[PDB]
Structures are given as C-alpha cells and as structure tokens.
Amino acid sequence: IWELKKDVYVVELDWYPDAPGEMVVLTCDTPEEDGITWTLDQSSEVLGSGKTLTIQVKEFGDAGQYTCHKGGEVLSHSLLLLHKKEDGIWSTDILKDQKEPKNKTFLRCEAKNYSGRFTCWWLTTISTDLTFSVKSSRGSSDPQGVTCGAATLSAERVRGDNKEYEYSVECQEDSACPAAEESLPIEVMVDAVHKLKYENYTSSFFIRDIIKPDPPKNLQLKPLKNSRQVEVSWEYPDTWSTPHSYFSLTFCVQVQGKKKDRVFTDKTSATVICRKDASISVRAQDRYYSSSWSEWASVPCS
Amino acid sequence: CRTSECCFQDPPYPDADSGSASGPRDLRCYRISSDRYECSWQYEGPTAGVSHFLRCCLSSGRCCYFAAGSATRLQFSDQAGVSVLYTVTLWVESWARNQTEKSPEVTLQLYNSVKYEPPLGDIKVSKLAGQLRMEWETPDNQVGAEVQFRHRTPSSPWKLGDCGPQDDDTESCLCPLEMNVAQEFQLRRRQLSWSKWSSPVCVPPENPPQPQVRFSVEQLGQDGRRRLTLKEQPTQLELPEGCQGLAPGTEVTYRLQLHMLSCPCKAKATRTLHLGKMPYLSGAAYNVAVISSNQFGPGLNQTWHIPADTHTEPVALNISVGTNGTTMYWPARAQSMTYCIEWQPVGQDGGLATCSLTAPQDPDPAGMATYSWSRAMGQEKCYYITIFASAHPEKLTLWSTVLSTYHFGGNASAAGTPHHVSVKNHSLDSVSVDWAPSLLSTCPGVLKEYVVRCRDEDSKQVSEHPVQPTETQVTLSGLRAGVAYTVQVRADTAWLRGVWSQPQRFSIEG
Amino acid sequence: GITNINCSGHIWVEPATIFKMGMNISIYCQAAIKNCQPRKLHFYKNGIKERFQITRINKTTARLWYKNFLEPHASMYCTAECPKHFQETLICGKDISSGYPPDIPDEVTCVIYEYSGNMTCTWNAGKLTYIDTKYVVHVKSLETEEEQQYLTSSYINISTDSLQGGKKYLVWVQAANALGMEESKQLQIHLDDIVIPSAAVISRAETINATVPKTIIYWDSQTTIEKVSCEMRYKATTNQTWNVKEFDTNFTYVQQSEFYLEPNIKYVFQVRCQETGKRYWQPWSSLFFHKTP
C-alpha cells in the first residue's frame, strides 16, 4: 500500500483465483482517540471502531471510500484504488491498445514543430467515472521542468459493437531550446483511474522522433496554356518553426485521379502533369532528420 | 440501480413456487475479455411478456440481481460486485404471466470459466520445408491453447491432426500439401471446452496449371494492322465441395506478355497485358506468352509465335547511292510518325533483319519520308524491305506497317545486264536469241520487262521490241540470208532502262 | 554506452560453443534483469529474429532449438521485453563456430632441392575443417633418437644443416584443432636419396629438312650431379596420349635429341629428371609448343 494523492491510496494485488490478497491498515487523521466509527462508501453500517482499522483487501467489493466519524460528524476520508497484478504483469484494461507501430503502444504523442510542444492522444471505450492525470519530466536521474495541462476529450467515434473515446493533453517544455541536440529523453506518466481500479502508463521519446509537420499551406495551381503540364505552388506550413533556412523541410508531390508520379522537391515549387479528374497532393518532412511524413493537403486538377 | 451494476436489494417479485416446466435453462457464464463477462441462457415456451433476471449470491451470503429485461443474455464487468476471484452461485429467475420460474444453480469461479474462440478468419498461408504452414494472430487474452485441425481434398474425407502447443502472439500449424488438387482446412482450439470449427481455409495447388488457351490473328489490313483474338478460355480448377465459390484469394491469375520480334534496335520491345484486353499488331513477327500464377508463385508458361506478313506492295521506294552513303525515300503516311525500317538479304535463310529507327517525321514537300545511312545494304543484292511506323513509339500496340517490298541494292542498271546471250540460226529467215535470267529476276517486282534490239549491218536499220520479264528465249523472223546482223538485250526496271548486253554479230548461212 | 555493451545475464549452448557441423543444438538464455520479470524472450541471429521453434520452459529461461546447424559462423544474442520498458532489453550473447575434426594426413613426402639448403615437406589436408586447424611436423632421428618439432598452417621447409644428428631420420605430421586431432603415418627419409636436382628448362626447337624430317629439341639443366636420368613427354596438340622416352644425361653441355615427327603438326614437350636410382622425380617442365614445317 502506498499513497497516490491526498486521501487516496493504491493497494496492489496478486490477481489469481482464491488469492489471499493483502493486509491493509487504515488510520483516521484526527487528534482524537475514542468514539470513532467507520463506514464504507455511502452505506451507514458500521464496519469497526477505534482509531485504527484493519481489513483484508481481496476484491473490488472490499475497496471504496472509507470514512471515520466521531460524534456524528465526518472526520476524514480514505479511498482504496486497487491495482491488479496478473502473474507479474500489470493490467491495461482502461486504455485501448492502438497496436501501432508496435504492440502495447498506449500513449501516442506528436509535435508539430521544434519549439517543444507535444500532445498525447489515448483511446478508451469507457464513458463514465473515468479520470486521467498526466505529469511529465525530462530525464529521471536529475529531472527538469515540463508542465502538462489537464486531460480533456477531443473526439468521439464508433468502431464495432463498442464506442471509442479519444482524449488529448497539451504539454510544454519549460526550458525549451529548439536548436540543441537532444541527449536524454522525455517521460510521460499517465495515472488512469476508473471507479475503483487504478492503472498507470509510461512513454518515452525524443522530440525529434515524434515530429509530424502540418500539411503544406496555400496550394495554388496554374497550368501552361493548352498544356497538361501544371506547376505547383505552395508555402511552408504556418506552425513550423522559424527561420525556414535553418529548419528546412523536404516536400513530396503526387498526382492521383480516377501511372504514378513521385517527386521530392526541396524548393517550394514543382511542375507535374495532371490527367483528367486528377488531384495534386502534397506532403512534407523535416529534411535532415527523417522523423515522419505529413498528411496530404490537396486541390484537384480541372 | 444501473445497467451494468448488481443491485444488492430484494427482487421486486415473490419467489418461485409454481415449478412449471417451461422457463429458463442452461445457464453458462464465460469470461470474454480481461474484465468483461457474459452469461447466456435459453427460455422454454412462449415469450409473451416475459422478463428474465440473473441472480447471484457471494461467499459472504449477500445476494444481488441484474435486470436483464427481456433479453436472453447479459454482460457485466468485474466492478459490478459479482465476485470473480472466488466462488459464486448464479441462477436465472424469469417472470411471466404473473409467475416465477427458476433455473438449476451453477457454481463456478468466473475468472476460470474461459471459452476459447477459433481464429478470426485472418489466417496466413505459406509453403515451408515441403509442408503447408498456416499462421494466425492469437485472439485477445486467449494465449495458451491446444489447437487441432481437420482437412479434406475433393476426393477424400476429413482427416484429423494436431499442430502442437501455441503460446505466442501468433500461432502456426504444419500441414501436408497436395500437388494438383486443392484442399479445405478447418481449425479449432482449446486451452491447456473445445472450440467450434473455423470458417473454411482453402489452399490452391503449389504449381498453377498450364494456361490452356488458343489464339487467332487477323489478316493484315491496309492500315498496316491486325488484331489478336482468343479462341479458347482456360479450364476451371477442381475445388472441394466446401471451397466451391469460397476464398477469392486462391484464384489463378493469368497474364499476357507480348514480345515484338521486329524492330530489335528499339529500347523496349516487350509489354505485359491482361488476357481481357486484346491488342492490335502490325505485320511484324511477335511472340505471345501466357503466365499463370497463384499465392505460391507462377506456373508453367506457354508461348505462341506470330510470323511476319509476306505480302509485297508496289510502293514508290527510291534509293539513292551517294559517295558518302545511301538514302531511302518513300511516301509518308501521317504527321509526327516514327519509322522503323527492316531489310533482309534475299536467299539468306534465317538471316536477321537489319533494323533502323528514325526520329518522328512529317511529310516533306513531295510527301515523302527519308532515312540515310553511311557506307549498309550490300551492293548488287536483293533485299526484302518492311517499314513500320507509329505516332506513339512507346506503345507497341500502336505500330503499323507502312510498306513491304523487294529492292535491288546498288547499280541495278549495270548488274541487271542480261548474261550468256546467244544467237543461233533457226531457218533461212529466222534466228533464236537465248539468254540467262538477269540478277533482277531474283528480286520480285524489280524487273519490269526485257527489250531486244536487232541491227542489220548492211542497211544499218535498227529495230527494238519489248519482251515479257519471264521470257529469256525468242525467235526473230523475217531476216535475209547472207546478211550480217547484230543483236543486244537489256533489262528494264520500274524506273530505269537497263544497259544493253554485248553486241552479238551473226549471219544466216542456211 | 557508445563504446561498450553491458550484458544483463548469460547464455550457453549445448553441447558447446564449438561443435560438429550439422548437429542438433540447444540455446538456453537465462535473463538476469534486476527488478523485472521477462515478458517475452526474443532470440536474434546476426540481427535477424528467428521467430520459429522457441519453447518457454520457465520464466527466466527459454530454449531455442536448431536442426541441422550449417553455418560456419553466427552471432547469437538473446533479448527480453520488460512490462514497463518500451524497447527490448539485451541479456547477453555468444559467438558459435561449427566445423569438422581433422582427417588423417597422408602422402607425406620430403625433398632436398639442389643448392637450396632446404628440405621441403608436404602432406595432404583431407576434408575442409572450417575452423582453425594447426599442423605440427615432427622430425626424429633414427641414429641419435633426437626429435625436432615444427609448426605451420600449411607447409614448411627444414634447413639441411639442422639435420646433423645423423643421416637416417623419421618424419610425421600432427593435425590439431578444437574438435579433434589425428596423426599421420611415419615416413622414412634419408638425405642422400631425397635430393632433387635443379629445374630443367627447354631452350628452343628446330626441324631439319632431310630425307626424313628430323626435329631436334634443345634443353639443359644447371645441376652438378654427375649421374642423372630423365624422362620427356611429347605429343600432338590434337592427341590426348603422352609419349615418353628415357635418357642418361651428363649436364656438362646442352644435351641434344632428334625426333621423327609428322609435318605440319604442332607438338608440345615437357621434361622431368631425377638423381639416378633416387625415389623422387622432378615435376614436368612447363609446356613448350612447337610446330613442324
């Protein structure tokens, strides 16, 4: 048993049939010594008496909000969140497994630019009583300052017989240096809590590893007169870092319609040929460190 | 209280004293996920206004119930209060027409009652070390299963076998493989209750069948093209009864590969097409190959050879031999046409045609196309010449034949001079003029006609008469005995008059 | 560490890291990671995960079993998946080599070469052992019972003036490697008999136009041995059979020899010689091509 938050305790359990559980002692936070009664959750039945309480935590029915009373008044609280340990492997029930790019990938984080802002998405099929709490830091031997806001809901979708909920959180590095060479990585630590079941996750990365620049901005096409050849013109994405002569982006251009066109231009313009009812589609990638490609932003050939 | 939470209060109906035969039965509860369980039962009799309830009683003795409504099954998670690490007692209570009907009690540990599911249709297939290998991803939270398979051919019944223990993220199963018949395979699992048999897995033969197809080619049109046509379609593969119309991934794919034998000086002369898209061909020679393939690879291919057209057309082909090279002139067909010229020496059985490719050409002021080469067509020889052209040289199916004819290289006028010319006395007033066929006769369409010249030496009178190109013997009549005469013969072409043979002097003695 | 790899356990292979080619081996990786139980072990071969045929005997140690291991060299290291860590964790690794025990060496011969001051010895190697094999040459005297040992990866020479312990000696070679060791048969040598003269070279060849065409072949050897017998092979370029004749030659001058050969036919010639009566012969001389007029 250990402390997670103020007046919230996490009890570990070995999750095998007919388990012996764990031994747990509860102590009311009061200078008083006599006339103390205890109840579990909203039930009014008295479980025990005295300053100390001993229970044996065997299942979710024995966990819940414990309250000590004296004189008919609420003294303090003590919540018990279980933490299943299945043959040495902890449970991952709450957060849905994305399985990309590898298995057990629960938190997926991305950054638009190099300034030090990332954002982590995680999927679940649980609608009510769900409460996340994110904290993060850079390194573990001597941590630095990275601040994360509250975790909100971004979008909701339906897949299969169940639903699916997508959360997100915005984090900023406090001492961000966009130009340095990273040596030690960032840690993200999510504490997923659902009713009385506690879980907890971790992801580590380099900022240069999770960069996915925005789709290229302001796509305009002007073909040669009476010619199918079209020169492509665009500009660097707005959210990308500055100056653009330092943080350089190598692009990609395809022509799709309903014969494959693939060109990678380091210049903001290129020329291709559009077939009938085709679409010019553009990508982007950081030129020097191959982190990731961008989503296509397109306009159609007419 | 809630849809997924047990209520630890009394059911709002009295207990069952009726004991009617019709009611809930066969209550089984399995664990479907890491924290979700389901319980299913069957109801006997009419379902007119029947509400079922699932009841549970923990080890401590406190009893709770779920409000299943009119559904025949219910789902709940481990936080509902139903104990999952211990011993619980579950029984179904149904309310109908103002009566209660209970079910036989079942006592189990819900964390242990796990039912395993067969693979979810996505089974990989492969050939390894002479035996068929199939791999499937493991179902979620269902590791550690004994897996057992059954298989059959079109002519054999089910045969049962074992694959071995499975304890990974993806499973595997080693199975024998048939050579020409397909197989059906069905699969089931059980943890270290046996699962239901899978959806069918169908396996095609390791070697695809030979493409049993027949082709036909049209006659060469005036546009210089002919179309290829399929006379017979490939025979269908024999599949087991359970695989007929099932498993589109076991189908044989057929591809048509075209190889243009003419214009070998071109960069690319091969193209692959679908058997459903029949191509247009020129008067050139082509090789057509059909390749059959399946998930294991390609089978044996069949190739058909299409010969070149032998028809000769009288086209105005002018060839000029200069001090620096030879130039060809012929009527242009259309604008921006790329021409490929092929010539073969006559009498050279199996000799490869010399290929010459031109840049795209437009008709000149005289409406002619031209090609020049350095000092090359050997001199004093006959060549069979065929010209092809295309406005889209990259598309082999758009090439067309421009002309096909024979041409004599070099000085046709000098080399075409009739040889072995002889004059023999036939009568007191006639002579026989016999000669050997000129070299031009060996070039079809080049020799237009012969001309015979007779000169009376005493009167100096000269007479000329044309002779057919197939005749090398003529009898000249109406001559005077005792007079000296001179005779010469020449071979004329479609454009130039030949050189006269050496003058033969003769006189009629008798 | 960018310069070092830290092992986090140990690994051993049965029967041994060195074993006979093609046998059945078993690799036991025992993960010793602190504060972690290994979720999944993940063997690798030269950076390629061989996923098939693994058995999880027990939580710390999994076994990978090979059938017909046919690689001369392979790098094998085992990795692990910790429940909390994202990347696989390296346990340790080992390098294994497979080969054959050495064959028995035969065909032992030794020759002194004229003017060389050396005895040269050679012996056959047998089948390819695929591993480091070393040859030890033992040279024991029959007169003083003194033995001289020598080492090579292939062949060796013994200087003539080290064999002062008499004239009757005994030579045999010993082949050694990790998977076995075998000894050759003992070869009896005497230094007078094993002398081979200096190499004989053909100089030229001319044909004389006589009543019968006579072809003379001109050749010499720089030996100082008085008694020398030789053999020579001559044949047409279109024929497969060899024709050899015997000579007794004194090399004070260039020896001459006549031949009656067919005209307009190219022939080829080679020579070999020996000290008369001795066991060994010279190798056949390089090929000389001559065409009769």
């Binding site: 340095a180 943080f247 020097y288 | - | 950076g47 790098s75 390296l90």
Partner: protein, 144 residues
Amino acid sequence: PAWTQCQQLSQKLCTLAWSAHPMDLREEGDEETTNDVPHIQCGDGCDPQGLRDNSQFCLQRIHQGLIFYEKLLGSDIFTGEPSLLPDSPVGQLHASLLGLSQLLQPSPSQPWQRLLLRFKILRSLQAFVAVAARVFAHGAATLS
C-alpha cells in the same frame, strides 16, 4: 569557412547516415553518458542567434564531435569482423567525415558486440549530423 561546400557535403552526410541505419535494444546500466560522447547542447551558440553572433564557438564543438565520430568509425568496431563491405555506405561515411573535418580547420570488442555497437553509433551519428547539416545550411544563405 567555405559555407557552400560545407553545406552540400553535410547534406551528403545526412543522407548517407540515414542510408546506413534505416531496430532497438536497451542496454541496462546506462545512466551517465557524461563525457563519453560530445554533444551539441544548448549554450554552444548553434542557434541562429549564436550563428549571427559568433560562429567560432559552434564550429569548435562541431569539429570536436566530427573528429570523435571519425575515431569511432575508424576503430575495430567498423573495421573488424564481421567485416563491412568497402562499397557499403559505412565506408563512405568515414571519407565524408574526414572531408568535413579537413574543410573545417586544416576497447577491443567481441564479434557479437559489434552489431549492437554499430547500431548505437549510427543512432548517435544521425542525431549529431542533423544539427551539423542545419548549422551549415543556415550559414550558406545568411552569412555569405
């Protein structure tokens, strides 16, 4: 310095280092890289403001890192067995590194350790060559 040639050869360096190592294994006990590998930290003046203020500070660190990575790429890790192909991109990496260091300022291991060591060295090399190519890219368009 010769900014244009340095920029184009550093582009060559980036694409070569990403052709050499296009995957992951964790060695326990690694908490103190310290002075094992020189890195371009914040405060070495390799940001654009540092370039426009004083390039010498950044180029000093870049040259030290470059010579360190040539020393690593020239040791027995990349020359010893399993011997790499001379036509393989790894051999080109050392030549390009020597070129860059020239244009700027005129333990034994087992055969199984070397695969992992090569992967971890290429992983560090890509991360350093990225910032090197960036600082050379910014110079050839502003400090011409």
